[PDB]
Amino acid sequence: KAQGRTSGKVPIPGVKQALEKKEGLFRKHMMGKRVNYAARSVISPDPNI
């Protein structure tokens, strides 16, 4: 909304831009989260399990 300095790369995105993006708040920290008690690793084949 604000023009201000109009030199480009506007700082302090403000409390709307903290909510609206692919990241925002509402898709990076509510609809998807990071979890405890989890692991990840490369998988390898086995016919004996």
């Binding site: 390898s44 084949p45 086995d46 016919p47 004996n48």
Partner: protein
């Protein structure tokens, strides 16, 4: 520079130290090569982005990329409007200036209206398509600009409107500024005081524009490896250095004017006022050149000819030696094209036979765009002597262009390096182009260099615009073949190659068709695509994926490693030479840098721990040091 492999060892280098790169703050960087348009040759191109510019702009237009002798480029585009108006487009200081042609045609020399007529209508007087377009170009000037009766008055007008952005001083008159606009912008490969040659070429570019809108000519493909060259890494470094000293001479001038907008003290004959300015002028050019090699970002107040301002430089990598030597053969189409939605620039084409490798291109997103040069593909760095060629074409059947006035697709416009020199018939042009090649490879002619390419384009129905284009400049891709009479070596470029018959093996030479044969069929592959054993037995994506996987092996980067402090290196301990290997494995000296190790490999399903990718290493072989590295 000129230093033995013994003395490269005594100065802490690898014995076959490769060179060809820069060291910038420890990081070991080089300049990517770019694929750009061929210099000094007009290209009849249709483009849908020409009607973007607004009203009555058609999809047609000639484009020439003219370079100066200091390898600095200036592109002129010659549009065709649907109203019969024909314009002229150029750039200056990131800004784009549209002008009529017959203000630029009439400022070059003293022109009548038959000289502009006969330049475009040599014969084809009775071609009613073409003489009607011409008086929307001769009446449309004389109606729109009715006060321009000679050359030294149209220079007044063209120097009046172009005074601010050309940044002239108030002592320069109107025609002195208007002569700069013709010296610095239109067709700059013909030099300054080359206006008699700049006039014949603009006539050639108007009729080629008119022969494209008549449908008589196929539109030249800018993405097809014959109408394009290679902007080298060192020539790009000198284009930006000329611009950096140009900002330097203007930052002196801007610093003097900040002293007369205050009025401190001025004597320009004084020794100590000169030193007083240059204390304050930033004269550290060499860190601005280091900033180019540090990030690749092209900063330019003018703006160069190129179409992007980022990613010109890359880091030379020593993850092995095959990754390192393949940076120096890598060429790139442009970063403008990886953003595109259409994947036709990525297509493998027959005009790259011998000049780009069909296999060696990276899998993924730069596929088709980041392809590598072939084996024996060389690039013209200096230009050869073209002073003696016009005196030889005159000894042959060429009629000189100063007193011929015979334009058209019905005749063969003989050019050298974009200078139109004369006119022949199409029957006589094929004989001139064949004797120039025979005189060339037999080195008894004093002035025909063997890297001169002889691009004869025979006439056809609605094909390419014909001609006898000869080239000798810089930045040209070249490769060797064998010329079948006299059996000598001939040097052939990609513009020649489209109309020449070049057999692959000597067992396929057929009577009265092939005039050339390849030396070896292996001269069309890369270096790394030619080390793959028995590659004519694999499927083609498996040869292409080897060129990706072969760069990423841990092998030997070098042997001077205790005198290096790179960020990370990968070194396999016990390499071996291969039993099964190509002959080029020895010529490129790959024994110095072993990539891998021989292994007893049993093609068997035995364990059950291996499907489609997975493999079984032997445990005791591993304990005995198999494939160990650090």
């Amino acid at each position: 520079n000129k230093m033995s492999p013994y003395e490269l060892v005594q100065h802490k280098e690898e014995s076959d130290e490769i060179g060809g790169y820069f060291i910038v703050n420890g990081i070991e960087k080089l300049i990517r090569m770019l694929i750009v348009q061929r210099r000094n040759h007009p290209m009849a191109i249709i483009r849908p982005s020409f009607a973007n510019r607004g009203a009555s702009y058609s999809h047609y237009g000639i484009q020439i990329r003219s370079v100066r002798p200091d390898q600095t480029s200036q592109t002129n585009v010659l549009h065709y409007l649907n109203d019969g108006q024909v314009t002229f487009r150029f750039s200056w200081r990131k800004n784009e200036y549209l002008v009529p042609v017959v203000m630029i045609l009439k400022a070059l020399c003293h022109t009548s209206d038959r000289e502009i007529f006969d330049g475009i209508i040599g014969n084809d007087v009775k071609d009613s398509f073409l003489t009607d377009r011409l008086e929307l170009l001769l009446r449309g000037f004389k109606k729109r600009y009715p006060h321009l009766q000679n050359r030294t008055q149209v220079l007044q007008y063209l120097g009046d409107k172009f005074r601010v952005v050309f940044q002239a001083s108030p002592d320069q008159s109107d025609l002195e500024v208007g002569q700069e606009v013709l010296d610095r912008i239109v067709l700059v490969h013909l030099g300054k005081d080359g206006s008699q040659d700049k006039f014949r070429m603009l006539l050639f570019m108007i009729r080629k524009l008119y022969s494209l809108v008549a449908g008589e000519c196929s539109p030249d493909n800018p993405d097809a490896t014959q109408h394009q060259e290679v902007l080298l890494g060192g020539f790009l470094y000198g284009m930006i250095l000329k611009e950096k000293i140009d900002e330097y001479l203007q930052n002196i001038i801007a610093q003097v004017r900040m002293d007369i907008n205050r009025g401190m003290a001025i004597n320009f004959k004084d020794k100590r006022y000169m030193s007083r300015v240059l204390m304050r002028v930033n004269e550290n050019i060499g860190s601005k050149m280091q900033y180019f090699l540090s990030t690749g970002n092209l900063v330019s107040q003018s703006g160069l000819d190129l179409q992007q301002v980022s990613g010109y430089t890359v880091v030379a990598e020593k993850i092995n030696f095959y990754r390192f030597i393949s940076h120096f053969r890598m060429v790139h189409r442009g970063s403008f094209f990886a953003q595109l939605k259409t994947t036709t620039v990525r297509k493998l084409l027959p005009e790259s036979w011998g000049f780009l490798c069909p296999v060696h291109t990276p899998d993924g997103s730069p596929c088709g765009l980041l392809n590598h040069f072939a084996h024996k593909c060389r690039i013209s760095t200096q230009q050869s002597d073209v002073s003696r060629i016009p005196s030889i074409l005159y000894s042959l059947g060429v009629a000189p262009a100063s007193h011929t006035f015979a334009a058209g697709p019905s005749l063969c416009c003989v050019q050298i390096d974009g200078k139109i020199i004369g006119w022949v018939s199409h029957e006589q042009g094929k004989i001139i182009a064949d004797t120039l090649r025979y005189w060339k490879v037999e080195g008894k002619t004093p002035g025909l260099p063997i890297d001169l390419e002889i691009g004869y384009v025979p006439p056809s129905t609605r094909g390419q615009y014909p001609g006898l284009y000869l080239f000798g400049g810089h930045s040209r891709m070249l490769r060797p073949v064998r010329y079948l009479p006299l059996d000598k070596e001939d040097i052939v470029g990609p513009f020649e190659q489209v109309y020449m018959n070049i057999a692959v093996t000597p067992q396929e030479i057929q009577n009265n068709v092939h005039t050339h044969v390849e030396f070896t069929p292996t001269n069309i592959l890369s270096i790394l695509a030619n080390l793959t054993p028995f590659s004519d037995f694999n499927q083609s994506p498996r040869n292409m994926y080897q060129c990706q996987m072969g760069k990423q092996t841990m092998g030997t980067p070098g042997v001077a490693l205790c005198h290096r402090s790179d960020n990370k290196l990968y070194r396999l301990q016990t390499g071996q030479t291969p039993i099964v290997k190509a002959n080029l494995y020895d010529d490129y000296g790959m024994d110095n840098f072993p990539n891998g190790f021989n292994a007893v490999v049993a093609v068997i399903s035995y364990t059950g721990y291996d499907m489609d990718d997975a493999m079984i290493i032997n445990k005791s072989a591993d304990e005995r040091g198999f494939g160990y590295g650090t």
